């Protein structure tokens, strides 16, 4: 009962068959992009059929009325000549590709793509209320078109585009429990204000509440006014210079004063979700196949090997527990956590664009 | 008589324009009036809109523009061709009436008016490293069928026709160019002084420029060389005015001037595109699709120049530099107008301005 | 490919005061970019019509050009004895510019 996605050309002479729209990165391999292209050989007079696996860091919408600045950067380009078939194609046809070839006949040919291990995931930065739909984001796509060569321009009447996504899911192994400590003593009193906060888990699913165990040991003579617990999202755009952007995605603030020479202990509960963050610019959201609604972007997981692995947008989450104290002296602790989904069952234009990105978000 | 005709990719929509070039007369612009032929049965419930869009654009016309891009609509006009507007502007012209009587009931007119303070169709020459991306003011007309203006247009049932706004040499000649500049030494009372002048204020494209250099070097310094150059001044104005200079023609001869001796020569220099194809930011005249246009004509502006500035403005000046021994270079600039004879601030804006200066300034 | 300007007839016999029409048909749909020339024997050609309708400056008004799609016609309303010559049809819309084979007008 296996089913396959299919999209046809506007003139109906070209069709792409992909068994998946989401391809999972396993931190050592990415799910291979294997598909089938059905062509009309009599419609092709002296033309070949090419399929491209393009991933690009883009700013702006996909329409033509894109008044204002725009940007594009192909993070990875792959090309495949589906028809006429390549003499030596990568990998033998998979089971689903063989079944599709059997179903569709001799006018259907496979294509094979390999996504490199250092590519980003499909992410999207939330457009601001003032931005006319423009959004920074890493987008994967597959386009099938007929042409005499790759250099020949693609035509809408025959080319067909199918957006795909690269995704990651929560690792099976658990992580170390977050824990942070920070002390702050006065100029003269030997007593030192000190709090320790901790998350019960290192990994949290989307929509799952975060329980932080704040524990203040205030032996000084200063009184803590409030205890603020916040969740912040850290989008790390890396094209040629790394620009880190922090967006507060959840705030829990309670008025629980701490008397001098008295300990404290509480279990705050905070949940990051999109309902209250819809007006924020630069909020990283998960990849979208269309204009549908996705949740907060999952934390980007990178391999232990250093390499570079930095491109597009990298997402990280940290819980901040700030204590506001009389006569200044605020003390804070950050607890980095990973937010994911469970596994289902130096060109001038570029530099000017980092300038623009910092101006916009930072 | 004849009329241009472009049809929709599916053939259900056609645009008829008498002209593709519209002349600015410094008090009026040639009105853009045409005819649109539709298929009322094909459009079951849709309307037909034609847009007169002019935009300052950077980047080539394709969709996969690898790198930065920028667009700024300098003027937008919308006309609902079908169903016809109850009170259309102006009665249909003679050509529109003939087109309607030729094409029948399923043809409807559209009318556009270009405001007086708009730029002409210009294009800055892409650099050899630049991948076809180029700054330029472009006029266009797009006819599309849609439920409303806000609905996105579709390629199958929309047709685009690039038009151009052009200017031609004024009939009345201007004052003859003339410039004087002196450079006296710190001790000697004698002052080096040259005279230069163009024979005309207005030159056509491909017409040579005769400059009358007249050096009176009574000092004790010797003029080693006399350099005659033509410079193009593209003046891009979006939110901050930025002037760019491109040398388009050079005539240099080794004519030394002895101390206490006059000089007089008539140099001939011609600006042309053959030797300027590798220059970036060189303003060229508006191209319809891809044809080779000459150097951009000088932008003539009204006396009522309250703001009058938008897009790219082009000016030309002739410079006569004398390379004098022991420094003291003295130069004179001769502004001339180069045309054709009449035939018979947001973040994106500021960032793009920074980009434009960095690229071609 | 190149464009053929099939000029018809290859020759014709006329007389003073008669009306002579020389046709020209383009293989490919050129625009109004068609010109007409008059080459008397032993002399260089002489432009008569350009843009398929615009009479060249100095040419007598009896010559006129017209276009019907890809068919171009040269007409002499009141033929004079000075008009007995060869007439060539040239298109200049695409390189190479191609000439018609000519139409010798004889008394």
């Amino acid at each position: 009962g296996t089913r396959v996605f299919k999209k046809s050309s506007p003139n109906g002479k070209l069709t792409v068959y992909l068994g998946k729209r989401d391809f999972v990165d396993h931190l050592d391999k990415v799910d291979p992009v294997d598909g089938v292209v059905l062509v009309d050989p009599d419609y092709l007079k002296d033309r070949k059929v090419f399929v491209t696996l393009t991933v690009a860091f883009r700013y702006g919408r996909e329409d033509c009325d894109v008044l204002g600045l725009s940007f594009r950067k192909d993070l990875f380009i792959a090309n495949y000549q589906a028809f006429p078939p390549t003499p030596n194609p990568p990998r033998p046809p998979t089971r689903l590709q063989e079944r599709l070839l059997r179903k569709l006949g001799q006018h259907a040919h496979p294509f094979f793509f390999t996504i490199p291990q250092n590519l980003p995931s499909s992410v999207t930065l939330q457009p601001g209320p003032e931005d006319t739909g423009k959004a920074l984001g890493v987008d994967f796509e597959i386009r099938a078109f007929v042409a005499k060569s790759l250099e020949e321009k693609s035509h809408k009447r025959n080319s067909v585009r199918l957006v795909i996504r690269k995704v990651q899911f929560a690792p099976e192994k658990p992580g170390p429990q977050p824990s942070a400590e920070t002390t702050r003593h006065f100029l003269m009193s030997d007593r030192s204000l000190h709090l320790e906060a901790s998350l019960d888990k290192e990994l949290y699913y989307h929509g799952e509440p975060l329980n932080v165990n704040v524990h203040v040991t205030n032996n000084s003579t200063k009184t803590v006014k409030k205890i603020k617990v916040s969740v912040r999202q850290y989008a790390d755009i890396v094209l040629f210079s790394t620009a880190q952007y922090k967006v507060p995605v959840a705030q829990v603030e309670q008025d629980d004063q701490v008397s001098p020479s008295s300990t404290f202990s509480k279990v705050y509960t905070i949940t990051p979700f999109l309902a209250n963050n819809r007006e924020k610019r630069g909020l990283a959201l998960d990849g979208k196949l269309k204009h549908e609604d996705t949740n907060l972007a999952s934390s980007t997981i990178v391999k232990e090997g250093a390499n570079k692995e930095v491109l597009g947008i990298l997402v990280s989450y940290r819980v901040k527990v700030k204590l506001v104290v009389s006569r200044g002296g605020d003390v804070s602790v950050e607890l980095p956590f990973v937010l994911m989904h469970p596994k289902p069952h130096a060109t001038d234009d570029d530099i000017v664009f980092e300038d623009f990105a910092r101006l916009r978000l930072k | 008589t004849r009329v241009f005709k472009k049809s929709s990719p599916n053939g259900k929509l056609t645009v008829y324009l008498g002209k593709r070039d519209f002349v600015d007369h410094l008090d009026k612009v040639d009105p853009v009036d045409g005819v649109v032929l539709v298929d009322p049965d094909y459009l079951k419930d849709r309307k037909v809109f034609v847009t007169l869009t002019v935009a300052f654009r950077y980047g080539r016309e394709d969709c996969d523009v690898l790198g930065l891009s920028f667009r700024k609509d300098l003027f937008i006009a919308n006309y609902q061709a079908f169903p016809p507007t109850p009170n259309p502007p102006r009665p249909p012209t003679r050509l529109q009436e003939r087109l309607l009587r030729k094409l029948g009931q399923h043809a409807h007119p559209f009318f556009f008016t270009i405001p007086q303070n708009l730029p002409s169709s210009v294009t800055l020459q892409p650099g050899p490293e630049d991948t076809g991306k180029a700054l330029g003011v472009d006029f266009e007309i797009r006819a599309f069928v849609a439920k409303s203006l806000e609905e996105k247009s579709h390629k199958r049932n929309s047709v685009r026709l690039v038009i151009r706004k052009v200017q031609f040499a004024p009939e009345k000649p201007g004052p003859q160019p003339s410039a004087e500049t002196t450079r006296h030494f710190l001790m000697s009372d004698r002052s080096l002084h040259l005279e230069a002048s163009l024979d005309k204020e207005l030159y056509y494209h491909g017409e040579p420029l005769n400059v009358n250099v007249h050096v009176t070097n009574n000092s004790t310094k010797t003029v080693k060389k006399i350099k005659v150059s033509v410079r193009q001044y593209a003046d891009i104005v979006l939110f901050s005015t930025a002037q760019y200079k491109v040398p388009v023609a050079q005539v240099e001869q080794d004519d030394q001037v002895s101390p206490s001796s006059t000089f007089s020569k008539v140099y001939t220099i011609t600006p042309f595109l053959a030797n300027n194809r590798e220059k970036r930011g060189l303003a060229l005249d508006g191209k319809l699709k891809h044809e080779d246009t000459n150097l951009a004509s000088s932008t003539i502006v009204k006396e009522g120049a309250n703001k009058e500035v938008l897009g790219i403005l082009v000016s030309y000046r002739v410079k006569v530099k004398l390379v004098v021994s022991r420094g003291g270079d003295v130069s004179v600039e001769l502004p001339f107008v180069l045309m054709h004879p009449k035939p018979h601030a947001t973040d994106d804006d500021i960032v793009f301005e920074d980009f434009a200066r960095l690229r071609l300034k | 490919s190149d464009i053929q300007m099939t000029q018809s007839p290859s020759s014709l016999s006329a007389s003073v005061g008669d009306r002579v029409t020389i046709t020209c048909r383009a293989s490919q749909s050129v625009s109004s970019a068609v010109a007409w020339y008059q080459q008397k024997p032993g002399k260089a050609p002489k432009l008569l019509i350009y843009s398929a309708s615009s009479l060249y400056s100095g040419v007598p008004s009896r010559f006129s050009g017209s276009r019907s799609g890809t068919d171009f016609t040269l007409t002499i309303s009141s033929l004079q004895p000075e008009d007995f010559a060869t007439y060539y049809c040239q298109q200049y819309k695409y390189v190479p510019v191609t000439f018609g084979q000519g139409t010798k007008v004889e008394i």
Binding site: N11 | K6, K102 | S29, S31, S68
Partner: peptide
């Protein structure tokens, strides 16, 4: 047969 994108041509404003 012409499946390519229609270009700009001309027609005689008559009949």
């Amino acid at each position: 047969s012409k499946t390519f994108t229609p270009s700009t041509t001309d027609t005689s404003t008559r009949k």
